[PDB]
Amino acid sequence: HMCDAFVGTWKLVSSENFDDYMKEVGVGFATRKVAGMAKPNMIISVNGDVITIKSESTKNTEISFILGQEFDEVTADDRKVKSTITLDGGVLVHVQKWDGKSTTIKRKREDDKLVVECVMKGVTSTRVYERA
Numbered sequence: 001h002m003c004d005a006f007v008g009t010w011k012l013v014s015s016e017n018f019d020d021y022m023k024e025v026g027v028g029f030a031t032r033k034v035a036g037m038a039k040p041n042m043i044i045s046v047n048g049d050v051i052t053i054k055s056e057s058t059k060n061t062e063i064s065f066i067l068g069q070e071f072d073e074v075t076a077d078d079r080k081v082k083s084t085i086t087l088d089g090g091v092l093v094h095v096q097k098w099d100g101k102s103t104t105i106k107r108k109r110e111d112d113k114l115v116v117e118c119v120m121k122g123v124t125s126t127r128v129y130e131r132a
């Protein structure tokens with residue numbers, strides 16, 4: 001019953017500061033513009049200890065992982081990162097490390113929304129998803 005409140009299909013309904021977050025991460029102009037237009041669906045499922053998070057839009061990406069166990073991830077902007085995802089007080093905390101840099105993506109349930117907060121140095125972006 002780990003992560004039950006996260007499981008399902010979620011659709012993006014609002015975004016703030018995502019371009020600036022992508023700039024900070026180092027995403028190039030064309031990818032920022034196309035990514036910024038996307039209205040992804042996020043599909044979260046659990047089977048045993050394995051959590052799967054898919055992002056589907058007009059790129060489709062998927063990660064599967066066990067909490068606390070590092071994995072290699074190729075991100076939507078083609079960074080090759082080492083990722084670890086943990087549950088901290090009900091919040092899924094995803095840390096990505098690459099080339100001496102680090103970014104953290106937090107996913108939390110708030111009312112009927114799933115809120116995704118992305119942070120790189122001083123820059124925070126907030127993305128809000130609702131059930132599909």
Ligand SMILES: O=C(O)[C@H]1CCCN1C(=O)Nc1sc2c(c1-c1nc(C3CC3)no1)CCCC2
Nearest residue numbers: 022027034035038040057059076077116118127
């Ligand atoms: O899951 C979320 O809400 C947030 C969590 C952080 C990533 N993220 C996205 O939505 N990333 C998305 S969605 C999408 C693209 C990217 C994309 N991210 C980045 C770098 C910032 C990582 N570069 O492209 C490009 C093409 C198709 C649609």
